[PDB]
């Protein structure tokens, strides 16, 4: 469960992300596709080459859903019920992959926010991505 310190930590870090959220979403996806090629099986309809417009646009959507989760940190299941339905009944992405994207998001954050990515903040962000993942896979069966 997210403690008060975690929520504060997550709000602060994401606040600094600010207008780069979309750029960081896209970079996290690109790192995921390269590092964990099995994840490409879910995007056979995308052009997955460097700088493709599909990856960029998708990076923005992912980043925006996270902004929304951070803003609704105390009420995630409700704020993300629609995305949760989407993943469980249409996309049907195997749960193992959420860990892979989460890790790539952390690496992206670490790479772009050196001063803000302290040990305690690293801990909170990992817990937060794990809760988001839990929520997005809660209706799978």
């Amino acid at each position: 469960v997210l403690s008060p310190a975690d929520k504060t930590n997550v709000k602060a870090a994401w606040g600094k992300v600010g207008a780069h959220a979309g750029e960081y979403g896209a970079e996290a996806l690109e790192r995921m596709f390269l590092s964990f090629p099995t994840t490409k099986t879910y995007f056979p309809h995308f052009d997955l080459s460097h700088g493709s417009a599909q990856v960029k646009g998708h990076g923005k959507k992912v980043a925006d859903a996270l902004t929304n989760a951070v803003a609704h940190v105390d009420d995630m299941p409700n704020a993300l019920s629609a995305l949760s339905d989407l993943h469980a009944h249409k996309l049907r992405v195997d749960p193992v992959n959420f860990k892979l994207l989460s890790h790539c998001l952390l690496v992206t954050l670490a790479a772009h926010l050196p001063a803000e990515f302290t040990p305690a903040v690293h801990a909170s962000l990992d817990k937060f991505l794990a809760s988001v993942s839990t929520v997005l896979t809660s209706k799978y069966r």
């Binding site: 090629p37 099995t38 099986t41 469980a88 799978y140």
Partner: protein, 146 residues
């Protein structure tokens, strides 16, 4: 894939008693019922909404038989799983777009199905051998992914 000689005789001994047609349908069917998200690959199969719809679906049974026929054939080539499954690996990656985690889920369900059919005969040591075999097969089916 470290199968000791005695592990390999255990695996082959038991496999000799399997009805692959029947076990193939049960394993594929149970995969789709226990891990419903795996149904994403089978929308052309028709009705998969309830357990009896899935378990008795003639397309699920025919597909299970095909999957397990290829698996058996692999048990005849335990020293060269990678080579044996190379063209299937490529096909699953490039044409079908199947996340290799699905091969691991199926392996585990196959183990429960074998346990179900054989009872006491599926001893802890026999299970341990089969766990190495299903992991070896999953790894071989994934080796051509890129």
């Amino acid at each position: 894939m470290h199968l000791t000689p005695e592990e390999k005789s255990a695996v082959t001994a038991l496999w000799g008693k399997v009805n692959v047609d029947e076990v193939g349908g049960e394993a594929l069917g149970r995969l789709l019922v226990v891990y419903p998200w795996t149904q994403r690959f089978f929308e052309s199969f028709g009705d998969l909404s309830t357990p009896d719809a899935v378990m008795g679906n003639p397309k699920v049974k025919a597909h299970g038989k095909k999957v397990l026929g290829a698996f058996s054939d692999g048990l005849a080539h335990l020293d060269n799983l990678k080579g044996t499954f190379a063209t299937l690996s490529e096909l699953h990656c490039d044409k079908l777009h199947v996340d290799p985690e699905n091969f691991r889920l199926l392996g585990n369900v196959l183990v429960c199905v074998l346990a179900h059919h054989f009872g006491k005969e599926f001893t802890p040591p026999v299970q341990a051998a089969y766990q190495k075999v299903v992991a070896g097969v999953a790894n071989a089916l994934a080796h051509k992914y890129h």
